[PDB]
Design a protein around this ligand. Structure first.
Ligand SMILES: Cn1cccc1CC(=O)O
Lengths: 237, 300
């Protein structure tokens, strides 16, 4: 059924699974019209579909043209995301298809279940984890490819860079979620932490800087501090 | 007017006939029910005084044969049987009437309740839902499961209602998933009405039969079927106007007849609130919405 802290290690077993996060599919700026009414302007979004064991990220870029002339866009966005995950599964060889898809928001359950009727053996599950995948658009190279898109496009990334050469997928997922939680709580400071040192760079083929193991321990500590600091600023503690 | 004689009443029992009921004491001189209206299906049903477990009963149509009830002490229940010897049957009934050992089907002349509950219910369709082809009448009880229940276990003893499942390939066309899942008109009109039921009368007949088995036997799978067939209509944007008007009448009489004290178990809060207040047909069921709001405002 639902995925939580009691079965957390299941994420890193050898059954192929994907997280699907739809929080950046339908994105808008709200603004005043000349008449002083309010209107929205859509901007490009993305589906965040992630294999937590391998780091493989299937980023479907959602171009604003997909909303043209459509009504009830927030409801349409769940079904567009569900249609996109289903053509993603169908495009994969059978031995690469997931056995489970975990949606980060419960409102995605029925749209995805309906798209995946043809795959009765793929389990569609919610989670009780509060995962920070909305902050994917705070990763500069992901944000860049989304905003530059002039048409629908799928771009593949490894969100763990080369970390799995040195650490396990449990530890890599933990590092990722801490990085994304920090970027979500205070983007400016998180990005300051990550790039403060000009001598550590981001390889062309990577998303994050090339930290040594010791530097990652330092970075990870600074990210926890940032989260605790913001928690204190928030609640006055 | 037709008659269902009883050989005897050896165990104390509450006997139902359609929406009426009466108590018979152990070994009381009871020999049946007379003045049963011709032209309608009927149901005669039983709840034993010493074990209210298992309500059970028999759907029948007196135009299709001469039926009587006889207690079986081995299987421990009142059984319906057909008497093929017509002159034997007439002679038995006339004797029991002369000695006034029969209750009269107690219909008030103003009262169309039973017609209104069974308008589209036909014995031939009952016998396809309840498969036991050697008898002209059909046995139903509290515990019988439906074909759909058995999919999610004896098939001979099942209620073969039409399977309705909103998250099924039958309900959802390849390329129209959002339109079909949010607007069930395709499923209602093409798949069910044109495809399976052939017309709205057969659809309403199954809906009415499901309600009646839920109410008279507390049959849980029948209650699921009744609600699913309502929800399917209410969740369709495109429904013929005559169907909506008839559905409002059907449901009105069903809600009117429901025992007030059983509303908690026979009515699904989610389905009724969705149907009356959120669905495409939220404004199309005026009679049903008015009786629901005045009789069961707690549910809403
Ligand atoms: C194809 N599509 C994508 C979002 C909504 C739709 C329409 C539908 O599935 O009936």
């Amino acid at each position: 059924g639902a995925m939580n802290s009691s079965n957390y290690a299941e994420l890193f077993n050898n059954d192929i699974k994907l997280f699907v996060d739809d929080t950046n599919v339908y994105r808008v700026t709200v603004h005043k019209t000349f008449e002083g009414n309010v209107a929205t302007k859509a901007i490009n979004g993305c589906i965040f579909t992630l294999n937590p064991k391998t780091g493989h990220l299937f980023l479907k870029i959602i171009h604003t043209s997909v909303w043209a002339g459509q009504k009830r866009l927030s409801q349409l966005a769940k079904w567009k995301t569900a249609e996109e995950v289903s053509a993603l599964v169908r495009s994969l060889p059978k031995e690469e298809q997931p056995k489970q898809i975990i949606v980060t928001r419960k409102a995605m359950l029925d749209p995805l279940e309906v798209h995946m009727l043809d795959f009765p053996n793929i389990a569609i599950r919610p989670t009780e984890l509060r995962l920070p995948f909305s902050a994917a658009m705070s990763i500069d190279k992901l944000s860049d490819v989304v905003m530059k898109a002039t048409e629908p496009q799928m771009v593949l990334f490894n969100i763990y860079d080369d970390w799995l050469d040195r650490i396990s997928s449990y530890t890599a997922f933990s590092r990722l979620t801490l990085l994304l939680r920090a970027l979500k709580t205070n983007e400016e400071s998180a990005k300051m932490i990550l790039l403060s040192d000009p001598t550590i760079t981001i390889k062309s083929y990577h998303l994050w800087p090339s930290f040594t193991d010791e530097q990652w321990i330092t970075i990870e500590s600074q990210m926890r501090d940032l989260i605790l600091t913001e928690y204190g600023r928030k609640y006055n503690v | 007017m037709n008659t269902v004689p009883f050989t005897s009443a050896p165990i104390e029992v509450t006997i139902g006939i359609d929406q009426y009921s009466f108590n018979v004491k152990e070994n009381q001189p009871f020999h049946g029910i007379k003045d049963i209206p011709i032209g309608h299906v009927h149901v005669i049903h039983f709840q034993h005084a010493d074990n209210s477990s298992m309500r059970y009963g028999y759907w029948f149509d007196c135009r299709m044969g001469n039926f009587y009830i006889q207690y079986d002490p081995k299987d421990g229940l009142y059984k319906m049987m057909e008497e093929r010897d017509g002159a034997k049957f007439e002679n038995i009934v006339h004797n029991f009437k002369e000695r006034q050992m029969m209750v009269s089907y107690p219909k008030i002349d103003e009262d169309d309740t039973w017609y209104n509950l069974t308008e589209f219910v036909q014995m031939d369709k009952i016998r396809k839902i309840v498969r036991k082809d050697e008898n002209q009448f059909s046995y139903v009880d509290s515990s019988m499961t439906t074909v759909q229940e058995n999919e999610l276990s004896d098939p001979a003893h099942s209620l073969n209602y039409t399977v309705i499942n909103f998250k099924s390939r039958e309900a959802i066309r390849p390329g129209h998933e959002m339109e079909d899942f949010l607007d069930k008109s395709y499923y209602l009109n093409t798949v069910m009405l044109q495809g399976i039921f052939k017309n709205s009368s057969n659809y309403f007949g199954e809906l009415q039969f499901a309600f009646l088995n839920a109410m008279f036997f507390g049959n849980y799978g029948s209650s699921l079927q009744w609600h699913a067939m309502i929800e399917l209509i209410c969740s369709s944007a495109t429904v013929p106007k005559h169907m909506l008007d008839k559905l409002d009448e059907i449901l009105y009489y069903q809600i009117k007849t429901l025992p007030e004290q059983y509303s908690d178990i026979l009515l699904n809060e989610r389905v009724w609130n969705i149907c009356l207040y959120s669905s495409f047909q939220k404004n199309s069921l005026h009679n049903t919405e008015k009786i629901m709001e005045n009789k069961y405002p707690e549910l809403l």
